[PDB]
Each structure stands twice: as structure tokens, then as C-alpha cells.
Amino acid sequence: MEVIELNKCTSGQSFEVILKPPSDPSLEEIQKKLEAAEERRKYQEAELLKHLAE
Amino acid sequence: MYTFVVRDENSSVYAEVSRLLLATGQWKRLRKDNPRFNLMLGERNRLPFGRLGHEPGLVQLVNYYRGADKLCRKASLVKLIKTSPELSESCTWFPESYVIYPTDEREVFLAAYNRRREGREGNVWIALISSEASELLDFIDEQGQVHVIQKYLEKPLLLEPGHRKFDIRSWVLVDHLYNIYLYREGVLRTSSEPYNSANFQDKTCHLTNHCIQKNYGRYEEGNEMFFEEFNQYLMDALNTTLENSILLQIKHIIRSCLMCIEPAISTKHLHYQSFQLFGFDFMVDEELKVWLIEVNGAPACAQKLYAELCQGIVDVAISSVFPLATSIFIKLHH
Amino acid sequence: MRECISIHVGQAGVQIGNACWELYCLEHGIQPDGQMPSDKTIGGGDDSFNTFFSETGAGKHVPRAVFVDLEPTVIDEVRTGTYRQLFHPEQLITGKEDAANNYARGHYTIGKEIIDLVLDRIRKLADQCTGLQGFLVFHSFGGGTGSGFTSLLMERLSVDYGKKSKLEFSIYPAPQVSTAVVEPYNSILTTHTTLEHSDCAFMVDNEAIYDICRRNLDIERPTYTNLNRLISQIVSSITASLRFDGALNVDLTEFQTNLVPYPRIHFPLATYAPVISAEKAYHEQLSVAEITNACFEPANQMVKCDPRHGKYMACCLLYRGDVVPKDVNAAIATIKTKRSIQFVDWCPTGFKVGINYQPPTVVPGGDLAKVQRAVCMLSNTTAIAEAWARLDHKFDLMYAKRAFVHWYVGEGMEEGEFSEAREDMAALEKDYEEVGV
Amino acid sequence: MREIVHIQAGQCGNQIGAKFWEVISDEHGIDPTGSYHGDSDLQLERINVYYNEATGNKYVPRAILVDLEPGTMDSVRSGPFGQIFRPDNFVFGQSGAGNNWAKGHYTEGAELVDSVLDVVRKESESCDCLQGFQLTHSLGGGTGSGMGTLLISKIREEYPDRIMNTFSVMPSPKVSDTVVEPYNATLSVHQLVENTDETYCIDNEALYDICFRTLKLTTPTYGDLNHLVSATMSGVTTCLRFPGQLNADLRKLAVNMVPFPRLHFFMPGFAPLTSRGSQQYRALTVPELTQQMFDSKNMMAACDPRHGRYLTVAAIFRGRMSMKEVDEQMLNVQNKNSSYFVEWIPNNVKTAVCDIPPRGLKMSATFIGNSTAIQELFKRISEQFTAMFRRKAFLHWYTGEGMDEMEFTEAESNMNDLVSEYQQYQDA
Ligand SMILES: Nc1nc2c(ncn2[C@@H]2O[C@H](COP(=O)(O)OP(=O)(O)OP(=O)(O)O)[C@@H](O)[C@H]2O)c(=O)[nH]1
Numbered sequence A: 001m002e003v004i005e006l007n008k009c010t011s012g013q014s015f016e017v018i019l020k021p022p023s024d025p026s027l028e029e030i031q032k033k034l035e036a037a038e039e040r041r042k043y044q045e046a047e048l049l050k051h052l053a054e
Numbered sequence B: 001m002y003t004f005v006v007r008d009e010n011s012s013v014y015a016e017v018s019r020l021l022l023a024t025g026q027w028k029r030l031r032k033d034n035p036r037f038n039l040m041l042g043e044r045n046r047l048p049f050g051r052l053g054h055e056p057g058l059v060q061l062v063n064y065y066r067g068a069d070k071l072c073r074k075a076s077l078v079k080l081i082k083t084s085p086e087l088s089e090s091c092t093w094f095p096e097s098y099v100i101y102p103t104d105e106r107e108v109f110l111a112a113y114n115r116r117r118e119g120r121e122g123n124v125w126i127a128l129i130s131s132e133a134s135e136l137l138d139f140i141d142e143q144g145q146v147h148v149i150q151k152y153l154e155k156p157l158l159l160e161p162g163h164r165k166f167d168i169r170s171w172v173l174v175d176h177l178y179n180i181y182l183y184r185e186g187v188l189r190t191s192s193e194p195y196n197s198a199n200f201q202d203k204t205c206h207l208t209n210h211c212i213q214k215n216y217g218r219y220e221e222g223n224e225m226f227f228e229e230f231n232q233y234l235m236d237a238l239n240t241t242l243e244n245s246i247l248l249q250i251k252h253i254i255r256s257c258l259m260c261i262e263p264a265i266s267t268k269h270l271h272y273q274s275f276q277l278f279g280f281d282f283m284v285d286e287e288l289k290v291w292l293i294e295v296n297g298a299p300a301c302a303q304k305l306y307a308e309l310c311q312g313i314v315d316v317a318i319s320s321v322f323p324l325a326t327s328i329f330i331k332l333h334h
Numbered sequence C: 001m002r003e004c005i006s007i008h009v010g011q012a013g014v015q016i017g018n019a020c021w022e023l024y025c026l027e028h029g030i031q032p033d034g035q036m037p038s039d040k041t042i043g044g045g046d047d048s049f050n051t052f053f054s055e056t057g058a059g060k061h062v063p064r065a066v067f068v069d070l071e072p073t074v075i076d077e078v079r080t081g082t083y084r085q086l087f088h089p090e091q092l093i094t095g096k097e098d099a100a101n102n103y104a105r106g107h108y109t110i111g112k113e114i115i116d117l118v119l120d121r122i123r124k125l126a127d128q129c130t131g132l133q134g135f136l137v138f139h140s141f142g143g144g145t146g147s148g149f150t151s152l153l154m155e156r157l158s159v160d161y162g163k164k165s166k167l168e169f170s171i172y173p174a175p176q177v178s179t180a181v182v183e184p185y186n187s188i189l190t191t192h193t194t195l196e197h198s199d200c201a202f203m204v205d206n207e208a209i210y211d212i213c214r215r216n217l218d219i220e221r222p223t224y225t226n227l228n229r230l231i232s233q234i235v236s237s238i239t240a241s242l243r244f245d246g247a248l249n250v251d252l253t254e255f256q257t258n259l260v261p262y263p264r265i266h267f268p269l270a271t272y273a274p275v276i277s278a279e280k281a282y283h284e285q286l287s288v289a290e291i292t293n294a295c296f297e298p299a300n301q302m303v304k305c306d307p308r309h310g311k312y313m314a315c316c317l318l319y320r321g322d323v324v325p326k327d328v329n330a331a332i333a334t335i336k337t338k339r340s341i342q343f344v345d346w347c348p349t350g351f352k353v354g355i356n357y358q359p360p361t362v363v364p365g366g367d368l369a370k371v372q373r374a375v376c377m378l379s380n381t382t383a384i385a386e387a388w389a390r391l392d393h394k395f396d397l398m399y400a401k402r403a404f405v406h407w408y409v410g411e412g413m414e415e416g417e418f419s420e421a422r423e424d425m426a427a428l429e430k431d432y433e434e435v436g437v
Numbered sequence D: 001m002r003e004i005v006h007i008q009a010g011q012c013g014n015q016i017g018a019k020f021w022e023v024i025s026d027e028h029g030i031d032p033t034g035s036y037h038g039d040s041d042l043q044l045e046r047i048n049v050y051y052n053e054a055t056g057n058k059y060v061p062r063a064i065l066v067d068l069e070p071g072t073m074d075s076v077r078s079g080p081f082g083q084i085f086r087p088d089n090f091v092f093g094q095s096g097a098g099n100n101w102a103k104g105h106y107t108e109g110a111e112l113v114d115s116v117l118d119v120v121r122k123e124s125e126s127c128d129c130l131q132g133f134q135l136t137h138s139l140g141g142g143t144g145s146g147m148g149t150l151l152i153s154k155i156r157e158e159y160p161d162r163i164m165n166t167f168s169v170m171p172s173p174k175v176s177d178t179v180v181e182p183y184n185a186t187l188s189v190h191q192l193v194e195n196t197d198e199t200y201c202i203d204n205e206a207l208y209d210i211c212f213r214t215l216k217l218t219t220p221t222y223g224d225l226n227h228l229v230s231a232t233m234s235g236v237t238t239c240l241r242f243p244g245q246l247n248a249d250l251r252k253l254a255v256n257m258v259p260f261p262r263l264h265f266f267m268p269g270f271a272p273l274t275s276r277g278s279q280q281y282r283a284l285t286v287p288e289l290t291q292q293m294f295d296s297k298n299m300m301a302a303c304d305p306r307h308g309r310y311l312t313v314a315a316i317f318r319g320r321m322s323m324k325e326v327d328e329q330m331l332n333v334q335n336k337n338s339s340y341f342v343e344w345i346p347n348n349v350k351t352a353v354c355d356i357p358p359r360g361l362k363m364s365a366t367f368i369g370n371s372t373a374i375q376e377l378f379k380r381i382s383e384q385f386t387a388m389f390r391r392k393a394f395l396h397w398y399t400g401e402g403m404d405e406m407e408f409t410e411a412e413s414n415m416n417d418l419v420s421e422y423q424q425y426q427d428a
């Protein structure tokens, strides 16, 4: 019902209509998690090349 | 070939519906968790409405209206009738009712009870049935779960020979297009032991539930009076038909209840579609006035009428959406 | 005047970026070569459009935009396309091989090798900013780059640009519009890692956009060109307040204020009307009452769900065209009576309205017709959790048998991260549950 | 990722391999000399994938031709498209493998394997970004079976992060060279289980039956059987060779088709099925294409897909047709037969349309199925193996090249493990 906060200009206008009232990881931690994933990829490739050496 | 799923095994009505669907040869059943269905015969608790209508190249339909629990819970029905202007506090076909929480409208309940206490008129209320306000309130808190206190109908209609009590069950099908279909056949779930105006402690004559009764089966088989006999009784005893005296009010209440919740539950423009069968429960007093007791989301049919209703469900709710290779319902126009 | 940097990650992000920046140029009068004859201050200025465009001494208006893909194909079409002179080469970053629909490959393997280069080229755009407010991130939930690399970027932007706001435009996966089987995995994984790092996120279900294209434009099999030009129109509505003179949503912090009370629940539903076919000769032009009413139809929503079964936390109506406040309020009053709009008890029942007199600009030869008035509604409804539930169910189905998991594990990611991500989603669905009933 | 390096090992490998290059050279508008003479620009937009741009702007297939016998490779060189292959890429020994896996993998093959890998390395260095490798070979002989699986192993060592893709012809008594084919197959399957990402199981039994029952040819040759293979090979690689909606490579195909690393053996299919020269004139409707490609009479592996369940499906429709009708038909087969597709992988059937049709057909469909029914193929080979092995029959051919009985038992074991692993997913 109530039309508050009305602001006008050439481009357009804006307003608010109330109808009823109411009742982080670090840089060090990112480098750590990514490199732990590189180690698991390294280990799995090392296990593969060991198996292929067998 | 259309495909369906069954997710309510305990549903006696829809077990017969699936049985009839398979028998045509144009419907195949899939496993509970197969998402590639045309029809869902869903579960009572926590139905996954959010998963419907998202499977490409399939028209999807379910046997439940999402939101229709607002009509089918005792607490919800009172809240809906009191707030919705279509019904209004002044509703005349619904008994005076109040919502009480155990540890809310407790002050509103006792304000009306005092007017009844000062005037000294009929002051009996149902929740166990008692005449004392403070004796019932102590028993609600004793239970645990939230229940409703309602004005008890102290002047019911008598059935002769017997001086008995009864409630009327009517089966209502709302289709995918929001057509309201009342099944022409209803049932009178009767009391066998005569009504006692003084002793409220006895519950077998006051409560007309099919479980409590099972003098069971004295006057008619399984405490069930069908529409032809009850019409015949009203003609002989009270000089009136069931159509005029009772059924017009029944047709009014069903229509008024479902028109109220149409904008909230309707699946007219949705990605999925819904139909639902309802059980409306009515009480007729001595002046032939009809009162709404409860609405049933998952209703059970009577033994004589299973075959006809379930076939009718397939006709206007299922085959209307999924066609194959006299009408038993009265349409309530709006 | 505060500046906004747009980041486009993966195929979906880049291709939507093309569509938006095309539309932005047509709206601001900017040509394909970057010249803007209406701009009088040559070589600089602190106008409203300078939030999205920087200026050179030559008179060229250049998007504050960085395009990143792990594979060259799609950005190569930007490099050689009709807007080749608009962006300078340093803004268009490509790798050699893509993330193969694998979150873990995009996040951990190829991600690590390109993260520093991207942030360096981002830093080059931030250096030209007199006062940076933050970032708009365009990506898909489905793609390996779009899910994997994006979540890593969002993590790093929280470190390097700690104060700044971040907004998402995310593409939700749909089987109807060329998806892969593993996209439910990629979605859950990226949402979890990004949840902390995004202030406001606008989900766009590919299913919803596909059907709007079918129903309203009469296009039988919609191409990406069709879908993106539609998506861009919606995106343009959302960002219009940052590019034009106004008092509503003037900066990125105001998007949180007006739409996001609960920080985790930061997924507003976008609803848009009217979508009208260009191939429709004779069209009955729709009124303010009719287009505001279309905001509460599920057939017009960017995500197919039912707002009637749920609660509102916020609501914004953004009008473009011939609209006056009187007609808005009159429409709201009628809609309030006939429809189920339920707000949460701890929030005011209300609408923040923004009107821009300039009607929506249509792409010449596009599928959308010119309209006299159009609206975009941004509503934070608990109903959008339906899309989480659908996706979580698909995740649960595959993960029960550990299907495809080995592809993720084979890129250095732990099996534990799957269930860790899924638990967060079970937390998220519950947050919506407590607020919603 | 764009460039694929092709290898063809042995008699079968080179024969189906030569036919593949013949078929796809036609599709890209390349003559036997290597010069482009086509009309559409789309024929050249993704020609990088299989061809190296040569001097004078001529195109040379990225193919390496391998055999322990000069015979079959001499036929290729003096064949219809023989002049197109880089002469340095012809790598041959002299003694042959005598239908012996052990000769291919351990003795004769070991001598020649390094010579091959030098050419593989030289083609790899020319690659802008190497996508992966494809091998055409049989599993029943010696060279393709023994040396092929040796080559795969050695390539996996040098290029451990690259896709290995194989077209592997399965042996059958219906089309048989020697009694030792089940021995050679069982030894090779062990290797393919561990060292390939995608294997297209081309069963000779199935190819015979298609020629006999469907194509109505009374006595089919190897030429008849290979026509079906080259058509299927062209079909499966359509999205790699031609521009479309699909921005996809071999790795993406491996990710989505293989839910579990060992179960990567696919049932290929084709519609419509046709014989050489004489082909049907009546146009196939989209409903007929879909109905045929899913039918077991069109499958290149002799398995009944009704005995198992589909883990993942991929389909490539070729030609100018209604993509809406394609979608409607594809979803019709799924929604009618949903008891044969796994419920635990959502949306596991994927379709791609390419506008360019193959030579002699207005529209065609190619099928790739990761079905649990493929166990029946391995069970067949396993039964034939045990029939001879329980009596240690014909084993002296292998023990004479230094092989032990242990290796046979281990190979039989890994195959019975594979079969029971397929059985694991057919019920719950
Ligand atoms: N709306 C829209 N969706 C797209 C577009 N391109 C791709 N998608 C969707 O995004 C998902 C796949 O993500 P892509 O962006 O293609 O993949 P990517 O981010 O490049 O990652 P990789 O290719 O795996 O390295 C699918 O669900 C597609 O439906 C587009 O232009 N518009």
C-alpha cells in the first residue's frame, strides 16, 4: 500500500512498496590441497611404471 | 504402452487401480525408483513433487495434489476455514473449532466457553469427549502431539428402528483440469448401539468409526447403509429425498472447500500434472443440517463400491490424460 | 563510479559472454570496432557505462572482460568473429587440452598449470580500476572447466581481492540440452567449493530456457545461439542497474542487501516476461498488469519450480520500457489477492521496484520481437531448492555404485571429497527446509 | 586435443585398417594420390585429426603399418589407396608369427617393436596436441594379437596420460584360421582389460551371421566381413572427423562411457545393414533406423543385449533428418524398454547428429553399447579355451617360445574375473 523511497531521473525511477511488516581458506591452504593432489597423481603414475617394469 | 510406478503398497484403492490398468494390456508397471514413468501412484509421506515433470519426452501425472494437506489435516482445516475469506469465521457448515498446542488459540477457546457457561446451553466438546474444559486440556498435554478442540454435535439425527448415530462418507475425484467429480454412491458408517445423551464416557455409540464398531452388523451388513436404503428411509420417516435434504449441502461444502484451495494447488499450467481422490466426512443433525467433520487425503473405499469407483478413476483421471486405442460421477460446476 | 570485471569460464561462460557483450554494445550505442559516437568525453570518464567499459586515448571502448577456456576452439571464434576488435588479445586466455567433463581435471590437474596466468591477466584489468567493487562469473555447472577451474578461481579471488563482491551466472544441467552423464557430479562438487565464495548466484536451468524457446519462439530444436541470446536478455536486465543511471541495485553490495539475507541461501529465482517471437506478425502488446502477472507463472521462470509451495525472503521487479509506478502498484494489488505469495515471518512482505524508460534492445535478426514494456523479477524463494533435490538424487543414484568415481580419483582428487560435498548439499537442502515450512 | 595416431597390426589389422582409410578418405574428398578434390569446406575443417598436412599441400594419413610378415603389407602398398601411406611408416619383419601369441609378444615381435615405436614417436612430435592412439588388430592370430598387445603396453609406458583406443576382431569357429585362436584371444583380453581405455569388440561370428542371415550372402569372404567393419569404424569416429554440435574428443568419450575402468568393451552396431555394390534404393525412416540399430541382428558382437543391461549407450545419426524425430524415437526405445537400461546411471543414452552422410546411403545410424551382455562373448572364448587347456593341448607351440602354463592359468583367471565383474551389475 505504502510507496516509500521514491527516486526519479531522466533514465527511469525506482521505489519500494511495503504491503505488510514482519513478525575462508588461505593462499597457503590452496597451495597445500593442490600439491597433495599432485602427489597422489605422482604416486599412481609411479605404481604404474613400476608395474610396467615388472 | 504407457508406464506407471507404485510407491504406496498399503493403498487398498490404488492397488486395485494398478490391477485394472495392467489388465488393459496398454500399461506396464516399473520398479519404485524408475524415473521414466507416465503415471505415479505416490507415497503418503514426503512425496517427491520436485522430481516430477523434468524427464524429457514424457507426460507425467501423479495421484496427489501438492498442498492439499492444508485441507486434509485437522489443524490445517481449522486454520484454513478461519483465515480464508471464502469460508470466513462465520462459516455455517463447519462446527466451532479451536487449535490447541501441548507443552495457539487457548484464550479464544475459553472466551467462547464462558458465554456457553453463563448462558447454560449445550456445552460439550470433542478432541475423548467431555463437558468440562479444564478436564480435556489436561488430557491433550498428556498425549504429546497437537490436536484440535471442536464443538460436539449434541443433537444428532436418529436412525429408526434403533435410535442410532451415523456419519456420511462421500468420495470426490478432482482431475487434472480441476473438474470436481462427486461419486454418486456414498456410505453411512453407522453406530449399532443406541445414542446415549447422558453418558459421554462410553465411546462405541458416540464414535461411528469402522474400527471401533468391529452389536456390529445387526441392522445392516458391516455397519454400512448405502444411498438407496437411506433415501428410502428419509422418504418414509421424514417425507423427503436424500437429494433435497442432505445432498445439496454436501455438494455445496465439497465445492466451497476445493474452490478455496484451487489457486494454491492447481497444476493447470505446471510442468507436471495432478489428480486426487478425497474422502469428505459429514454429520447430519436433527434439523437435517449437514456439518463437515474431516477431509481425507488417502481415503479407503467400502467393499461393495471398490470395483465401480476404481474403474471410474481410470476413466476420467487417467485415460483423460493417457487415452486408449454412462458416467458414475456428478460434476460440480464452477 | 565503481568498476565491474566480468569473467567467462568454459564453453557456456564464453558463449554467453559473447551474447551479453553483443547486447551491451547495442544498448550503449557502442560499435563492433569499439567506437561510441554518443560519448563526448574522449579517452576517459566516470559515466554509468564505464562500470563495464574502459576507454583508450584513441576513443575505443573496451569491455572489462576476461575469457578463459582450457581448450582453444570456442575463444578462437571470439578472436576471429564480428567482435574481434572489441577485446584485446591479453583478455582471451586459452589452454591446449580441455578438462574432459571432469571436475577434478579442471580443478586440480590443468587448473594448477593456468591459475597464476589467469589471475595475472585479471590483475591487469584491476590496475586500470579506480575503485573495484567486484566480479561477475559466467560458467556452467556441467563442464569440466566450467565447474572445476571456476571453483578454484573463486577460491583465489577471495584471497587476492578479499573485500570485493562476487556474483555468479551459473548454467544448471539439463538432459534436454546436450549434457554428459557425469554432470550431476561436476555440479555438486563445484557448488560445495564455491558456496562460501559467492555472494549472489543466478541459476539458469537449460531445461527452462529450452522450453521458453519452444513455446514462445516456435523454435523446434533451439541452438546455443537461440538460448544464449535469450539468457543475455535476462542477464542484461539484472546488470542494467549497474550500467545505467538509477537508485536501485547501483552496486554489487546492494544485490546481497536486497536479495540475500541468509548468506548460504544466495540463489534468487529469475522470472522474465514477455518472450515474443519475431516471426509473429500482428502482436497484441502486453500491459504492465499482464507482464507483472507473468512473473508468477512457472512457465516463465529460469528454473522450473513451484513458488506457491515455499516462502519468499526478497522480491525485486525490474521494468524496462513504458512503465510508470502507478501501473506497477495497481498490478501488485491484484496479484496479491489472486496468487499465493507467502513471505517468511522475519521479512517484510514487499517489492523493490526499478523502472528504466528505455525499452529492451533487440538483437537485429534475432528471434525476439521488440516489445513496449518488459519485466524481470528476482525473487529469493525456497522453491528453488527443488533443483538441488533433483540434482542430489541423480548424484545419489550414481555414487551408490561408485560409478565414474575412478576418473576423478585418477586426477588426484580423493573419494572423500564426493561425500564431503554431498553432505554440504544435505545441509543446504535442510537450510531451505527450516526457512521454507 | 585433435590429432590421433593410427596403428594397424597383422593381417586382419592391416586389411580392416586399409578399408578404414579408403572409406574416410572418400568422406573427406581425398584421392589415392593424397590430393583434395571435394566440394564442401566441412571435409577439411577437422582433417587434422587423421591426416598430416604434407608438402604441396597433400594429405598423408597418420597411420603406421605393422606386420611380422611382408605379405599382407605388400597387398596394401599395391592396393586401391596404397600410395597414400607414408612409405617410412611401413614397418615389417620377415619370419611371420605363425598364429602364435608368444611369437608376437615375446620372441619375434620383441625384435621389431622398437622399430615401430620410432615411427610412433616421429608422428607424435609432429602433433600439435596428441589426443591418443587407435589400433586395428585381431585377437586370434599372432602379430595383431601378440605384438599389438605388446605395442599397447610399450605405448602406455612412453605416453601414460594418453587414450588407447582399439578395434579388436574376436575369433569364432564359424570363421576360423587355426585351433589356437581361443589361446591367443584369452592372452590378449588380459592385456586389453589393463592397458586400453576403449575397445570395440568386433566379433567375427556376428559379422558372419549378418552376412549370412541378413545380407543373404551364402559364402562370405573376409572382404564381405570387412565392409561391415569399415562402415562401423567410420560411424564411431564421425564426431571426431566432422564439425557439428559436439565439441568432443576420445577422452570425453572414455569418461562418459566407462563407469568402471575394466568394463570398457563395447558392442558396435550399424543401420542400415548393406552388402558391397548392390545396395537398397528405398529410403529408411527415422523410426526404422532406431528400431534396427537397437535390434540384436545389427550388432557387431554376437551377444543378445536382452540377456544383460545397458550401462551406457551412444548413437550417431548421419544424414539430413528431423532431429526432433530422432529425439522422439530415441526416447521411445528407452521409455518402452527401461528394464534393459540401468536406473543408477541417469540419462545414460546420448545421441549426436552429423549432417554429412556416408557414401551410398542417404541416412545411417551407428551404435556404441557398454552392455553387461558382452560377458557372453568372453564366456564363449573361455569355454573354448578350457576345452583344449584341460588336456594341455597345442600348448607346445607356446612353451617352445619360453611361455609357462602359469601364464595361461592367470590369463584365464583375469577373464573369468572380468565376466563375474560384468555379472555384478546385471542384477543390483
Ligand atoms: N545455456 C548454454 N549452455 C551451455 C552452452 N555450452 C555448453 N552448455 C552446457 O554446459 C554443460 C557443459 O559445459 P561446457 O561449458 O560445454 O564444458 P566446459 O566448461 O568447456 O568444460 P570441458 O569442456 O569439460 O573442459 C552442458 O550441460 C551444456 O548443456 C551454451 O552456449 N549455452
Ligand SMILES: COc1cc2c(c(OC)c1OC)-c1ccc(OC)c(=O)cc1[C@@H](NC(C)=O)CC2
Pocket: C178, C179, C180, C181, C182, D236, D239, D240, D246, D248, D249, D250, D252, D253, D256, D257, D312, D313, D314, D315, D316, D347, D348, D349, D350, D351, D352, D368
Ligand atoms: C567424439 O565422439 C563422442 C564423444 C562423446 C560422446 C559421444 O556419443 C554421442 C561421441 O560419439 C561416439 C558422448 C558419449 C556418451 C555419453 O552417454 C553416456 C555422454 O554422456 C556424452 C557424450 C558427449 N557429450 C554429448 C553432449 O553428447 C561427450 C563425449
Ligand SMILES: Nc1nc2c(ncn2[C@@H]2O[C@H](COP(=O)(O)OP(=O)(O)O)[C@@H](O)[C@H]2O)c(=O)[nH]1
Pocket: D009, D010, D011, D012, D013, D015, D016, D097, D098, D099, D100, D138, D139, D140, D141, D142, D143, D144, D145, D169, D170, D171, D172, D175, D176, D177, D181, D204, D207, D222, D223, D225, D226
Ligand atoms: N573380420 C576379419 N577377420 C580376419 C581377417 N583376416 C583375418 N581375420 C581373423 O583373424 C584371425 C587370424 O589372425 P591374423 O590377423 O591372420 O594373424 P596375424 O597376421 O598374425 O595378425 C582369425 O580369427 C581370422 O578369422 C579380415 O580381413 N577380417
Ligand SMILES: [Ca+2]
Pocket: C039, C040, C041, C042, C043, C044, C045, C046, C047, C055
Ligand atoms: Ca567517457
Ligand SMILES: [Mg+2]
Pocket: C010, C011, C071, C098, C143, C145, D247
Ligand atoms: Mg569445453
Ligand SMILES: [Mg+2]
Pocket: D011, D141, D177
Ligand atoms: Mg591369417
